[PDB]
Scaffold this active site. Structure first.
Site, PDB file in Angstrom:
ATOM      1  N   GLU A  11       0.774  -1.225   0.000  1.00  0.00           N
ATOM      2  CA  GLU A  11       0.000   0.000   0.000  1.00  0.00           C
ATOM      3  C   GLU A  11       0.809   1.280   0.000  1.00  0.00           C
ATOM      4  O   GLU A  11       0.252   2.346  -0.202  1.00  0.00           O
ATOM      5  CB  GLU A  11      -0.881   0.105   1.277  1.00  0.00           C
ATOM      6  CG  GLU A  11      -1.790  -1.064   1.488  1.00  0.00           C
ATOM      7  CD  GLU A  11      -2.986  -1.179   0.562  1.00  0.00           C
ATOM      8  OE1 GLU A  11      -3.320  -0.073  -0.054  1.00  0.00           O
ATOM      9  OE2 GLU A  11      -3.611  -2.197   0.465  1.00  0.00           O
ATOM     10  N   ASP A  20      -6.980   6.337  -4.629  1.00  0.00           N
ATOM     11  CA  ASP A  20      -6.564   4.997  -4.751  1.00  0.00           C
ATOM     12  C   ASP A  20      -6.724   4.528  -6.172  1.00  0.00           C
ATOM     13  O   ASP A  20      -7.096   5.281  -7.054  1.00  0.00           O
ATOM     14  CB  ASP A  20      -7.119   4.088  -3.630  1.00  0.00           C
ATOM     15  CG  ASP A  20      -8.482   3.430  -3.803  1.00  0.00           C
ATOM     16  OD1 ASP A  20      -9.016   3.476  -4.990  1.00  0.00           O
ATOM     17  OD2 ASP A  20      -8.984   2.804  -2.902  1.00  0.00           O
ATOM     18  N   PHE A 104      -7.845  -6.844   4.106  1.00  0.00           N
ATOM     19  CA  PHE A 104      -7.615  -5.437   4.314  1.00  0.00           C
ATOM     20  C   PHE A 104      -7.863  -4.700   2.992  1.00  0.00           C
ATOM     21  O   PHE A 104      -8.249  -3.571   2.911  1.00  0.00           O
ATOM     22  CB  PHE A 104      -6.108  -5.301   4.611  1.00  0.00           C
ATOM     23  CG  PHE A 104      -5.614  -3.902   4.809  1.00  0.00           C
ATOM     24  CD1 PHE A 104      -5.280  -3.097   3.714  1.00  0.00           C
ATOM     25  CD2 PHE A 104      -5.366  -3.419   6.087  1.00  0.00           C
ATOM     26  CE1 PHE A 104      -4.719  -1.834   3.929  1.00  0.00           C
ATOM     27  CE2 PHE A 104      -4.847  -2.143   6.311  1.00  0.00           C
ATOM     28  CZ  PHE A 104      -4.553  -1.338   5.217  1.00  0.00           C
TER      29      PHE A 104
END
Ligand SMILES: [Cl-]
Ligand SMILES: [Cl-]
Length: 162
Positions: A11, A20, A104
């Site tokens: 990430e 994102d 996640f």
């Protein structure tokens, strides 16, 4: 290697609101703020998340705090999920890191979906779960990260991350 260093690689870290891969407003270490198109709904979510008026900017420390809460929440979402838990309980520690990564990133509802892969993982049919996991939007959208997670699940080693 561990789940924290694994996710920090996948990430990245960003101290300012950003978008994102999907187009959503994010901050820190993969912390989704909102799916709303408003930089303002996002500054709002951010402030509520941090407990202060940030103006869309946070420190390393704040980011790490968010990160910690999110890894914690992923684990707990897995353990509470009737579909996920048994698959998870059946895995070794490396593979577990992979499951956690998946959750996640895509949320428990998403993964809970991947029915067939889940079944093969549990049966410890490694090569086939890896093939099936690849037949997904996830893989097609973020192929390099997906490849890394998938090798982690297939192999039970951290090769893809070293
Ligand atoms: Cl939060
Ligand atoms: Cl990618």
């Amino acid at each position: 290697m561990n789940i924290f260093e694994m996710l920090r690689i996948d990430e990245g870290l960003r101290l300012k609101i950003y978008k994102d891969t999907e187009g959503y407003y994010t901050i820190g270490i993969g912390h989704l703020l909102t799916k709303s198109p408003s930089l303002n709904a996002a500054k709002s979510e951010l402030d509520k998340a941090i407990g202060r008026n940030t103006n869309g900017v946070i420190t390393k420390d704040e980011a790490e705090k968010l990160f910690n809460q999110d890894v914690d929440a992923a684990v707990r979402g897995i353990l509470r999920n009737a579909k996920l838990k048994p698959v998870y309980d059946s895995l070794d520690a490396v593979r577990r890191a992979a499951a956690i990564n998946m959750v996640f990133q895509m949320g428990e509802t998403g993964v809970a979906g991947f029915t067939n892969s889940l079944r093969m993982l549990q049966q410890k049919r490694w090569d086939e779960a890896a093939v099936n996991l690849a037949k997904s939007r996830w893989y097609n959208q973020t192929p390099n990260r997906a490849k890394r997670v998938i090798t982690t699940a297939r192999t039970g080693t951290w090769d893809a991350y070293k």
